[PDB]
């Protein structure tokens, strides 16, 4: 077989990106300042973290084994529990004590035949007493919220109609439904999208099969009262390329950013309208809602070139690292309209941004608060001379959070410091009676001075000030998505406003 | 109550001495070089590591909660398992989420009444299918060698005659006995020493009660074929001082270094002879044996002043940090002699040394190989300018290992590098047929450049060369004693030569 390296090599596993690969507990974490005693619940986050050195050189960040962190908060005390998802990949590679799964989303490069290729490293969400560890090429993996034990691959009591489950399901605060989909829903290179939803009782509600114009990456989607929206990243899959050992994804400069709109209830596949936004990269969705006119307001990160530059076009054409900026875009869509081309979006701020969060109590409805990561290149904000040599590569950089008030237009910016970078933030309602976007923000910091991770707790009253700084004595590798599960929420999700 | 700090403060918990307090697993550790495939067994080590910040300012290193590391070796692969001993202290402080036990060995400063005050941080040894986590003020805590689960306080099936069990029991390679003792054997300030042994079947053999001339610290002891030897450190205990909030230990410049010799079998308390070595500090025993003349050769680290300077005499008189050197001393004792004063010892090498190990296959018999820690102050060996600001305080420093051949007088010195310090080494016989001191040496390194720990594997054929360097992505806080449990040894201890 291809030889298995016995230590990590390359930029993707250097400095702060070096895997730690620890599982277990650190209770009673060190705290500078004071954690508000009223905060009770768990911050779950997932990071890609290769358990074994890959036989694939410069294996992308997105292909690392999912490791779940839980920060358990009560009476101003916090404990860390950390455990890898027991994917088929993790278990078989652990047994063999060497890497067996090959290139990102290319089964033809695997050293053994996998049934499930999930790294379960995309997202970690709460649904009906379980954690779901999500990866958009696979079904979810169900886990115990208390122990982080893996129960196994989850098929919703045999109801799961799709081979694939999105990393970005939406939770309706009114209906208590989990609104889902999968792309490549019938296997590698298929244009089949399965749109499906589950009621709070766990019974499947919607199941609509539709066809994508191209086999494009649909990473995120949006849900309104009456519509579901599928923005397609112009990364396109050719299974014949994959069979020769090629990349799953290849940029296509010749296609628009397709935005499919489907009626949310009682629709057929043919009811989908594929609107055509100006060519660009579909980033993460903040939220979507229908205004008084009944028009969809789609608010999402949007770039004008390939953010995933490591997957260029057929002739290897694409941007360089740190060249492409994503901006907080508003797209207006009308399902009634027969005009497929969409106008350029309006931009809500000028910041290079990503990883937008709202108060999920107004998810699928009009929101007036967004929290998002920013990358400010303004001199001095990040000491690049100090950070970059310690940073490694393969992961996006954010050197602050921003809070946008959509009513007033006021922006607050949290800057952790010149030698610190942030992950995706979570929002915690102050209590069940709290106004929209009123409460606490938590965000994991990479401290490049200490080569340690920190968990910052902010009050939305003043986002510039750390109320508490939780000091971890180890590195948590830069990760992807995380979620708050409040103790006062019986189904793990907050009550509607 | 005295307020509980929510983060660690002071030199004893700064830099590399900052508690990590992690429990769990890191499997398939990164390896530079090659671990010999024939090595099969576990390296167990214990470190003091406070689980919660103390309410006692500048709490000594020796008062930290015992955390057990296990390095499990097979076919050139190694896994780390890490778990705290579930002492009464650990469990009750974990329940309270704050420190409750007060000053080192002073129950009158405790915020609650403890039955057992053990931190189980002294040593971790194998006996009859269990680990024993040792602390000289308490009985052992029994643990699972595989899972590091704590079974609880161990009383040897109700046979334990003493309130105290030494951190330095001796394993006779011929008789397969565990030879033990406890000082302060009837509680705080008592001059009672209980000498006791267990046969390989777990039945108690010897139990002799004797009286110490003073209530002095007997940290280590020595066992020969026919004698047991108790060197007393001139640190003396006054319970009346303790009741006023004073130190358990206070140096006494007016007494010799007492060395008690007792017949190993069938003795009474009154059979002990208290010989009087020149005033000095009794360091760790390498080994003792009877020569052809029947005289005891006692080989141990020996200093001329108080190594534990933080416990000075009644008027606060004592040395400064890094001032006192310990030297590899040979004391000659004759149980038959009526002359109590002993001559100054002969010195086997000139090195400032401690933590001596032998091939334990010749324990209690003539040995011709010793491995020990050294601290070379020769300029350039340690980059003090770089290390000291990152080092913290409270723990002894060693910047190399030495192998002494007692026959030839040849010394090999392992220097890990200018920005690395060592812990206590272990010796592993190459195989069951290997000559004395022939095989492998392992030692945990503190790497002050990476602020990470490393486990170095050396061949005794050439101690200057690292055969393998196991790269931990976390710090293991400087610790005390560790032991090898070879897979080929059913009772966990090597066969006699
Ligand atoms: Cl890798
Ligand atoms: Cl599991
Ligand atoms: Cl992160
Ligand atoms: Cl402390
Ligand atoms: Cl336990
Ligand atoms: Cl150590
Ligand atoms: Fe995502
Ligand atoms: Fe010791």
Author numbering:
A (entry chain D), B (entry chain A): 30 to 526
Sentences copied from the publication:
Carotenoid cleavage dioxygenases (CCDs) are non-heme FeII enzymes that catalyze the oxidative cleavage of alkene bonds in carotenoids, stilbenoids, and related compounds. pmcCarotenoid cleavage dioxygenases (CCDs) are a broadly distributed superfamily of enzymes that catalyze the reaction of dioxygen (O2) with carotenoids, stilbenoids, and related redox-active polyenes. These enzymes use a mononuclear non-heme FeII center to activate O2 for reaction with a specific alkene group in the substrate, generating carbonyl-containing products of importance in biological processes such as hormonal signaling and light detection. Unlike many mononuclear non-heme iron dioxygenases that coordinate their FeII centers using a 2-His, 1-Glu/Asp “facial triad” motif, CCDs use a 4-His cluster, three of which hydrogen bond to second-sphere carboxylates (Glu/Asp). While one coordination position is occupied by a solvent ligand as demonstrated by several crystallographic and spectroscopic investigations, the other is vacant because of apparent occlusion by a nearby methyl group of a semiconserved, second sphere residue (i.e., Thr/Val/Ile), making CCDs five-coordinate (5C) in their resting FeII states.
To investigate whether reduction in side-chain volume would allow solvent binding at the sixth position, site-directed mutagenesis was used to introduce a T151G substitution in CAO1, thereby opening the maximal potential space for ligand coordination. Globally, the structure of T151G FeII–CAO1 closely resembled the wildtype protein with an overall Cα RMSD of 0.125 Å. Two discrete density map peaks were observed in proximity to the iron center indicating two coordinated solvent molecules. One of these (solvent 1) corresponded to the normally bound water molecule located trans to His197. The second peak, located across from His313, was also satisfactorily modeled with a water molecule (solvent 2). The newly accessible space for solvent coordination was readily apparent in the solvent-excluded surface of the T151G FeII–CAO1 variant. The average Fe–O bond lengths for solvents 1 and 2 were 2.52 ± 0.15 Å and 2.80 ± 0.10 Å, respectively, indicating relatively weak coordination. The ∠His197Nε–Fe–H2O for solvent 1 is 170°, whereas solvent 2 is distorted away from a trans geometry with an ∠His313Nε–Fe–H2O of ∼153°. This distortion arises from the solvent avoiding a steric clash with a nearby Ala196 side chain as well as its engagement in a weak hydrogen bonding interaction with the main chain carbonyl oxygen of residue 151. In the stilbenoid-cleaving CAO1, the volume of the side chain was maximally reduced by making a Thr to Gly substitution.
